[PDB]
Scaffold this motif. Structure first.
Motif, PDB file in Angstrom:
ATOM      1  N   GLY A 102      -0.583   6.465   7.218  1.00 27.86           N
ATOM      2  CA  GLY A 102      -0.129   5.271   7.946  1.00 27.86           C
ATOM      3  C   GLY A 102       1.168   4.663   7.458  1.00 27.86           C
ATOM      4  N   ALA A 103       1.631   3.605   8.130  1.00 25.96           N
ATOM      5  CA  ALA A 103       2.896   2.951   7.866  1.00 25.96           C
ATOM      6  C   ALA A 103       3.097   2.541   6.411  1.00 25.96           C
ATOM      7  N   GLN A 104       4.311   2.647   5.886  1.00 26.60           N
ATOM      8  CA  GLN A 104       4.550   2.284   4.477  1.00 26.60           C
ATOM      9  C   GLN A 104       5.441   1.069   4.339  1.00 26.60           C
ATOM     10  N   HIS A 105       5.188   0.203   3.362  1.00 24.31           N
ATOM     11  CA  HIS A 105       6.015  -0.958   3.092  1.00 24.31           C
ATOM     12  C   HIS A 105       6.447  -0.896   1.615  1.00 24.31           C
ATOM     13  N   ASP A 106       7.748  -0.984   1.348  1.00 23.10           N
ATOM     14  CA  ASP A 106       8.222  -0.885  -0.034  1.00 23.10           C
ATOM     15  C   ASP A 106       8.550  -2.227  -0.689  1.00 23.10           C
ATOM     16  N   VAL A 165       7.331  -2.591  -9.583  1.00 25.98           N
ATOM     17  CA  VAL A 165       7.652  -2.244  -8.192  1.00 25.98           C
ATOM     18  C   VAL A 165       6.383  -1.709  -7.541  1.00 25.98           C
ATOM     19  N   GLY A 166       6.322  -1.750  -6.222  1.00 23.48           N
ATOM     20  CA  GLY A 166       5.139  -1.292  -5.519  1.00 23.48           C
ATOM     21  C   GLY A 166       5.424  -0.894  -4.078  1.00 23.48           C
ATOM     22  N   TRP A 167       4.366  -0.386  -3.453  1.00 20.97           N
ATOM     23  CA  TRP A 167       4.427   0.029  -2.051  1.00 20.97           C
ATOM     24  C   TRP A 167       3.008  -0.004  -1.504  1.00 20.97           C
ATOM     25  N   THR A 168       2.880  -0.068  -0.171  1.00 20.32           N
ATOM     26  CA  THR A 168       1.610  -0.036   0.486  1.00 20.32           C
ATOM     27  C   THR A 168       1.596   0.981   1.630  1.00 20.32           C
ATOM     28  N   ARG A 169       0.383   1.349   2.019  1.00 21.47           N
ATOM     29  CA  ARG A 169       0.145   2.245   3.161  1.00 21.47           C
ATOM     30  C   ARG A 169      -0.929   1.538   4.012  1.00 21.47           C
ATOM     31  N   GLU A 170      -0.659   1.309   5.291  1.00 19.49           N
ATOM     32  CA  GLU A 170      -1.594   0.563   6.140  1.00 19.49           C
ATOM     33  C   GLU A 170      -2.855   1.324   6.500  1.00 19.49           C
ATOM     34  N   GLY A 171      -2.844   2.637   6.362  1.00 21.11           N
ATOM     35  CA  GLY A 171      -4.010   3.426   6.760  1.00 21.11           C
ATOM     36  C   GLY A 171      -3.784   3.865   8.209  1.00 21.11           C
ATOM     37  N   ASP A 172      -4.576   4.822   8.637  1.00 16.32           N
ATOM     38  CA  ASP A 172      -4.551   5.385   9.984  1.00 16.32           C
ATOM     39  C   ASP A 172      -5.982   5.345  10.518  1.00 16.32           C
ATOM     40  N   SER A 173      -6.126   4.944  11.784  1.00 15.49           N
ATOM     41  CA  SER A 173      -7.428   4.782  12.404  1.00 15.49           C
ATOM     42  C   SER A 173      -8.206   6.078  12.497  1.00 15.49           C
ATOM     43  N   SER A 174      -7.550   7.230  12.469  1.00 17.01           N
ATOM     44  CA  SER A 174      -8.243   8.509  12.463  1.00 17.01           C
ATOM     45  C   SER A 174      -8.619   8.973  11.061  1.00 17.01           C
ATOM     46  N   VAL A 175      -8.357   8.206  10.007  1.00 20.92           N
ATOM     47  CA  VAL A 175      -8.827   8.615   8.678  1.00 20.92           C
ATOM     48  C   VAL A 175      -9.582   7.360   8.209  1.00 20.92           C
ATOM     49  N   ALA A 176     -10.899   7.404   8.342  1.00 24.37           N
ATOM     50  CA  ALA A 176     -11.738   6.259   7.999  1.00 24.37           C
ATOM     51  C   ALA A 176     -11.480   5.659   6.629  1.00 24.37           C
TER      52      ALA A 176
END
Ligand SMILES: [Ca+2]
Ligand SMILES: [Ca+2]
Ligand SMILES: [Ca+2]
Ligand SMILES: [Ca+2]
Ligand code: NA
Length: 483
Positions: free
Chosen positions: A397-401, A409-420
């Motif tokens: 899913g989408a990434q935010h830096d 420092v860090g980053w995130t991943r929102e996840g994808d609805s097809s990967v529970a």
């Protein structure tokens, strides 16, 4: 699923002839932790039984002919290798073979050749008059005979060598012959860096080009390879490497993923190689290795906001293979530049949980190096495996830096609805610990997330807006995921 490569060897793997059986026995484990492709060491006969494969003698001997006093290579016999490959394949793991084409080593005999010396700092300059030498250029393959290929090598298939058996002196010798000249294009370091070591293959000779293509197709078909790793690419005519890859792809009908080792800490020169090979293969991100090493060695003083500066992954993400360490950079080796151990988990978090680049895990980091120094790499598999599970199951899913502080420092991943339950929040710091507010997506509002590494025991609750306040210990890493 995210793909992950594994380099399956280290410089000090033992010469016990059991490396293919070790790989065979590890196939289930590698598939369970998320490895999708393995790079194996050179599988053909070297100048001696104990050579790692980078001084290749006969590319058509995969450990089945009696040559150099041994049937097996350092790694095992051909049938053991074919059984290891069958085991990986039945677990949906791909196999990439190492390709060592710059030079040949271990000739059966010397030949008389006319040569000139050249300047080591500028190989375009001849520094002697011509004279006769005795060079190790006669390759006859006495234990194989004509099986598979009747091609025999002589001085005129090579551009130069580094030893004269006559006078017993080591120099860079360029051979005289019909149309002899160093190949181009190659790196322009030292004027022309075609010459590296042993007997240098002449990729201007048309029979050499034709035979090496034929061998490539043979190798891929004999072992059912899925791709290749190209050794010493900056020392081999670029347009030949482009065409060699294309001819194997054409003949087998397979994708044949290929990554080239172009060793230079300079993004611009790596981009030139990509352009010259028509974007038909990836390169290893050498500049990123050096940035990670630098951060690991300044005791908190590096500006972490600059980790991506000058790297191939920031420019050409789809053509980069990212890595932390390898057999070249491990302790005691030629290009030694190891990432210090305290920072290694932070560096693996950086390459495995971010969306760009194809990452490689090093065998030496998972299992330890067995060199003889006092600064060997310890086995870090219990620290790396939780990070691999984060790549396998949560990094989608989408990434935010958040590259906004000189230490944290860090980053995130929102996840994808097809990967529970996918989605994650990573933080790393080269200095003291602390906190950072980061966005993980409003669709994850109200969830309890926890540090999968185990470094922190307190969970975090994502607020109604999709924001969470994440924490991290000093000189450490935390990766939060759904509890
Ligand atoms: Ca040449
Ligand atoms: Ca060369
Ligand atoms: Ca810092
Ligand atoms: Ca969720
Ligand atoms: Na050459």
């Amino acid at each position: 699923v995210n793909g992950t490569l594994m380099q399956y060897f280290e410089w000090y793997t033992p010469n016990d002839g059991q490396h293919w059986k070790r790989l065979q026995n590890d196939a289930e484990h590698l598939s369970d932790i998320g490895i999708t492709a393995v790079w194996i060491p050179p599988a053909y006969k070297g100048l001696s039984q104990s050579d790692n494969g980078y001084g290749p003698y006969d590319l058509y001997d995969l450990g089945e002919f009696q040559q150099k006093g041994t049937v097996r290579t350092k790694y095992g016999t051909k049938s053991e290798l074919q059984d290891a490959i069958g085991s990986l394949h039945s677990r949906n793991v791909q196999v990439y073979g190492d390709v060592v084409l710059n030079h040949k080593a271990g000739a059966d005999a010397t030949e008389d050749v006319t040569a000139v010396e050249v300047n080591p700092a500028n190989r375009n300059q001849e520094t002697s008059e011509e004279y006769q030498i005795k060079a190790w250029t006669d390759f006859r393959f006495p234990g194989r005979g004509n099986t598979y290929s009747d091609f025999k090598w002589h001085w005129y298939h090579f551009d130069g060598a580094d030893w004269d058996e006559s006078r017993k002196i080591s120099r860079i010798f360029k051979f005289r012959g019909e149309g002899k000249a160093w190949d181009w294009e190659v790196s322009s370091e030292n004027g022309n860096y075609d010459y590296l070591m042993y007997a240098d293959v002449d990729y201007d000779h048309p029979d050499v080009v034709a035979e090496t293509k034929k061998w490539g197709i043979w190798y891929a078909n004999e072992l059912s390879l899925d791709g290749f790793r190209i050794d010493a690419a900056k020392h081999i005519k670029f347009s030949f490497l482009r065409d060699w890859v294309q001819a194997v792809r054409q003949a087998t009908g397979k994708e044949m993923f290929t990554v080239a080792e172009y060793w230079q800490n300079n993004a611009g020169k790596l981009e030139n190689y990509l352009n010259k090979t028509s974007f038909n293969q990836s390169v290893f991100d050498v500049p990123l290795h050096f940035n990670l090493q630098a951060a690991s060695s300044q005791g908190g003083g590096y500006d972490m906001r600059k980790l991506l500066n000058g790297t191939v992954v920031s420019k050409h993400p789809l053509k980069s293979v990212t890595f932390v360490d390898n057999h070249d950079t491990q302790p005691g080796q030629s290009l030694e530049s190891t990432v210090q151990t305290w920072f290694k988990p932070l560096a693996y978090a950086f390459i495995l949980t971010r969306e760009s680049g194809y990452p490689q895990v090093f065998y030496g980091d998972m299992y330890g190096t067995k060199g003889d120094s006092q600064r060997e790499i310890p086995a870090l598999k219990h620290k790396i495996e939780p990070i691999l599970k984060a790549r396998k199951q949560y990094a989608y899913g989408a990434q935010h830096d958040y590259f906004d502080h000189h230490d944290i420092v860090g980053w995130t991943r929102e996840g994808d609805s097809s990967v529970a339950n996918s989605g994650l929040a990573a933080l790393i710091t080269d200095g003291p610990g602390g906190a950072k507010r980061m966005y993980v997506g409003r669709q994850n509002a109200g969830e309890t997330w926890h540090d999968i590494t185990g470094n922190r025991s307190e969970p975090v609750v994502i607020n109604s807006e999709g924001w969470g306040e994440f924490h991290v210990n000093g000189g450490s890493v935390s990766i939060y995921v759904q509890r």
